[PDB]
Each structure stands twice: as C-alpha cells, then as structure tokens.
Design a protein around this ligand. Sequence first.
Ligand SMILES: [Cl-]
Length: 291
Amino acid sequence: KWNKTGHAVRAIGRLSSLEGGSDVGRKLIIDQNVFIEGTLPMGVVRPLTEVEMDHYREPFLNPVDREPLWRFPNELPIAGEPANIVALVEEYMDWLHQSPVPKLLFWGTPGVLIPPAEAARLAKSLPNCKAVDIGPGLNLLQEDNPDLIGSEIARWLSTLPFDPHYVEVLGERMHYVDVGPRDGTPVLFLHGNPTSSYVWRNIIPHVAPTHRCIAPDLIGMGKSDKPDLGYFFDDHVRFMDAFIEALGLEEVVLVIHDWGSALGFHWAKRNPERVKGIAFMEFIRPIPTWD
Ligand SMILES: [Cl-]
C-alpha cells in the first residue's frame, strides 16, 4: 500500500486526467509543489534537511517553472502509453541487451522504478554488467548511500559546492558541473526528475581525482534557463544532444539516473561507438501494466 502511494503520488497528474477525469493532479503538482514536497522526500529513505530541501526547492520556487515536474510523469512508459516513448525506450533496452559496453547497476530496497527483483534479473541478462546493492533506497539512491556509489564508480572506472560553468545550448544557457582532469575520457552525470546536478554532489568528489566529471542541469531545471516549453522528453533530447556537442565530447562514460537514464540510454543507442561505459540506477524501462 505505502509502496503504492509513492508511485501514485508521482503519477497523480496522469491518473487524475486519465482514470479520474480530473485536473486536481496538475493542481497539486503545479500549485502545491507536491512533486517537490512529496514525491522527492518519499524517494529517499533518510530524512532531508531543510538546507537540502531548499536546494531541491530552489529551481521551482515559482509555479510557472514547474512544467517539467508535471510533464515528466505524463511521459513515463506505462501500459504502452505514450506509444512514442514506449517504442523509444523499448528500442534502447534492446540495444542495451545486445551491447557489450561495460555496465554498472546500482539498486536499493525496495526501490521505486526498479524493484530489487527487477535489478537482479536485468543484471544477469545484460552483458558485462555488475550489480551493486546500496542497501536501503528508494529513487534517489545517491542521497541514501553516496559513499558506496561514489567509491564503486571510481573502482569501476579504474578497470576501464562546485563553481558554476555555463554553455549556450540552442539559444538557452545550461549550467553544469565540471571538475577533474582535462584529459582522458570524461564522465557525464545525468540527473532525473525532480532533481538537478545537486543529486550528484556527494558522488562527484569520489570520481574527481582521476576522471573529468560533467554534471549538467537539464533545461528548465536546476540553474539552467527555463523557457516556455512543454518540456516533453523530445525537448530534453534536443538540449542534451546539443549540450554534448557544445562541450566537444567525443567518447564518454555515462552515469545516469531516473529520466536522465532515458536520455543517456537514448543517446547511447544512437551513438554506441562513443560510449565507453554506463553506470545506471533507478532507470526508465517500459512498465507493462499499472498493476
Ligand atoms: Cl516522472
């Protein structure tokens, strides 16, 4: 039941329109900020300080800037809808099952998007994949066990409060973290909903002394510009594509989470020769039924 309310509140905007025929869900997300005040804390086992909540609250203080919080759950591949997202996601999960790229899967109990039984079955079926039990965790595993994730990523790469940096992307300014050495293969950290590069703040220090760490804020989120868009998945794809190109990235290691995993997997499927490794957690894959 309680595990179900978590998924229910995250999808309160979709279910209100679809099966309840009502707009209360959009009202709760846009006006009451339920995604920030509800879904986000219910995605972490440990309690969050008010300083931490304020960092997560900061990009969405104005309700007009909360469009991505509402559109993202409407894009989740659930029950075959939306059809274009499901086909997109099914396509990159087919590529992942075939790709020999080194993989590293973080998971927790009981998780949110990935139940423990799903993380284990997928870890066995994916080639060159290593699974890491972070212990207790829901959606934001980085906030429950950042030391293990940061340490395990650093070890995995060996076998292969930051200053703000900005780049203009398709007419918009996108903020990103950039630390570590200037040479070698960079590591790209893609956050999801409703977070920013802030969610990687305790993992990057573990990876910084040996590898470049690039952690951008998605358009409309974090310290990035927030134009008047619908913020569909296609919008995020266009901006992340141009972000990778604007930074001159050739080969890359991907560290992705939540909707950032959909972005990373969709980019990797279209640029497979440039992907040197994928570390992922609480990722986007098709959900057969609501049940
Ligand atoms: Cl979502």
